[PDB]
């Protein structure tokens, strides 16, 4: 059994494309650390993301700075998960408590031990897997990461739990509407 929302998404977008240009002529790449998989699910189906106030200021600056001379890529990982779950392109400046359009491109789990050997000189040579939200990846290291994520033969992705997230969100909504109703 597959969910019809996921089927509409799969038919309308080309997730995990076989021909992806990882050796960029230009562009900038950033690590997004999400608090939960729920946020990732919502982001994939609505093509939207928000960081913190400072995160949105930095991503705003990067997007407007690039002036469509190249892409701005976001590599997503949930705090404490041990893998990246996909990559999306930032597609609009931040709109104002600050949201912005994103286009998901890769939706696949890449374990951290596939990427931990890549270290970030602008972050005390710490592994790319030990980054904070909106940490920028140097371009050549970005190409190493994009190549690895693009070519990895993933065995799973958040899509495998799609219906589960669908149900969670729905229950949460009712739980809120009832609780709020009980207050007034
Ligand atoms: Se973020 C945000 C800010 C203002 C209005 C709406 C949103 C939104 O839809 N956010 C969201 C989508 C997916 C995952 C996390 C947050």
Author numbering: 363 to 458, 471 to 558
Could you pull the original sentences from the published paper?
YTHDF proteins bind the N6-methyladenosine (m6A)-modified mRNAs, influencing their processing, stability, and translation. YTHDF proteins contain a hydrophobic pocket that accommodates the m6A embedded in the RRACH consensus sequence on mRNAs.
To further study the ebselen binding and mode, the YTH domain of the YTHDF1 protein was co-crystallized with ebselen, and X-ray diffraction data were collected at the Se absorption edge to locate the Se atom unambiguously. The Se atom appeared to be involved in a covalent bond with Cys412. The ebselen molecule sits on a very shallow groove with one side resting on the locally hydrophobic protein matrix, while the other face remains solvent-exposed. In the first case, the selenobenzene moiety almost inserts between the aliphatic segments of the Lys471 and Lys473 side chains while also contacting the intervening Gly472; the N-phenyl amide group stacks to Tyr408 concurrently interacting with the Arg404 and Ile410 side chains. Although binding at a site different from the m6A pocket, the ebselen molecule impedes the conformational rearrangement of the β4−β5 loop into the m6A-binding-competent conformation. The selenobenzene ring in both ebselen poses clashes with YTHDF1 residues Ser461–Ala462 in the m6A-bound structure, while the N-phenylformamide group either collides with Trp465 or Val464. Finally, ebselen displacement of both Trp465 and Trp470 generates a unique pocket extending to the m6A-binding region that can be exploited by ebselen derivatives with improved potency.
